[PDB]
Amino acid sequence: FNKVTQKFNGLTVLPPLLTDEMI
Amino acid sequence: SNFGAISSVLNDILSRLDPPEAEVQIDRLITGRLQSLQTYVTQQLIRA
Amino acid sequence: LVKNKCVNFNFNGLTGTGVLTESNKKFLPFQQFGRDIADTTDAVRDPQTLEILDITPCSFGGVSVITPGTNTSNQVAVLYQDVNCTEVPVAI
Amino acid sequence: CALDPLSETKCTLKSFTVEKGIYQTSNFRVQPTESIVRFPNITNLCPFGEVFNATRFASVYAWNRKRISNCVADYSVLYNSASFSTFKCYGVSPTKL
Numbered sequence: 001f002n003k004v005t006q007k008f009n010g011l012t013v014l015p016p017l018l019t020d021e022m023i
Numbered sequence: 024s025n026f027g028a029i030s031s032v033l034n035d036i037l038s039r040l041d042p043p044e045a046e047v048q049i050d051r052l053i054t055g056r057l058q059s060l061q062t063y064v065t066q067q068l069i070r071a
Numbered sequence: 072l073v074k075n076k077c078v079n080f081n082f083n084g085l086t087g088t089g090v091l092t093e094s095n096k097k098f099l100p101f102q103q104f105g106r107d108i109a110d111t112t113d114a115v116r117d118p119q120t121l122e123i124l125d126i127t128p129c130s131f132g133g134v135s136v137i138t139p140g141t142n143t144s145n146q147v148a149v150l151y152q153d154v155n156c157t158e159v160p161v162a163i
Numbered sequence: 164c165a166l167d168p169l170s171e172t173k174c175t176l177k178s179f180t181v182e183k184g185i186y187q188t189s190n191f192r193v194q195p196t197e198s199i200v201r202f203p204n205i206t207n208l209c210p211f212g213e214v215f216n217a218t219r220f221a222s223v224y225a226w227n228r229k230r231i232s233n234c235v236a237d238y239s240v241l242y243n244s245a246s247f248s249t250f251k252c253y254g255v256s257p258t259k260l
């Protein structure tokens with residue numbers, strides 16, 4: 001989890017259903 | 024991108040021109056922005 | 072000049088809508104407005120006061136309704152998809 | 164369709180029955196409460212009379228240019244004049260000036 005690295009235009013990001021805690 | 028319209032800011036278009044001339048400018052932005060979304064969604068379907 | 076609420080604005084013909092606030096952006100004296108990574112105007116200098124104002128877009132989001140199925144009940148819950156609950160009631 | 168979120172959902176799905184689920188139907192937006200205008204605090208009118216009522220005019224090969232700056236330009240005095248046999252604008256409309 002340490003290795004891997006606009007909204008106002010009508011872009012959004014929805015959250016995943018399972019959290020990283022659940023996975 | 025302006026897509027051949029007078030400006031890419033549609034508030035600027037709509038501030039400078041009266042309606043029958045604003046419409047033909049806005050339609051150039053609408054068609055360019057539709058083609059941009061259509062391209063993006065097609066490639067997201069292929070990545071998915 | 073009206074801060075801290077959503078307004079239409081026009082500075083020297085630079086029109087828009089949004090919330091105006093005071094700004095930490097330390098413009099050099101010749102700079103007239105600020106622009107973001109998307110090349111969107113996001114701060115401005117007031118032409119009479121010479122104060123720097125941040126521009127924040129007026130709150131918005133998606134709306135979605137949760138249903139137990141019509142066959143079960145006609146009551147529902149609503150999700151305002153990316154807002155703080157403090158903002159919500161002005162949806163009316 | 165606009166009565167209530169469930170009615171809006173029925174109307175979104177185009178069915179009188181809605182099965183169990185979550186559906187996105189609309190966008191929330193806050194609405195502008197006021198308008199403001201902020202322009203420079205200056206008052207001297209732009210010198211259009213010195214251009215339009217000049218006695219001498221140049222030959223077209225040696226055309227004059229004048230620079231207009233630091234003034235308030237009322238264009239209505241021009242487009243509401245009866246005088247002009249031509250008043251064509253490009254990239255702007257006269258009424259908006």
Ligand SMILES: *[C@@H]1O[C@H](CO)[C@@H](O)[C@H](O)[C@H]1NC(C)=O
Nearest residue numbers: 152153154155156157158159
């Ligand atoms: C919600 O809004 C209040 C008031 O601005 C703020 O104190 C709080 O930190 C916010 N919480 C979130 C999660 O946005």
Ligand SMILES: *[C@@H]1O[C@H](CO)[C@@H](O)[C@H](O)[C@H]1NC(C)=O
Nearest residue numbers: 211212213215216240241244
């Ligand atoms: C002087 O110029 C202005 C601007 O074109 C014009 O309105 C006015 O009629 C002219 N003056 C006279 C006395 O006609």
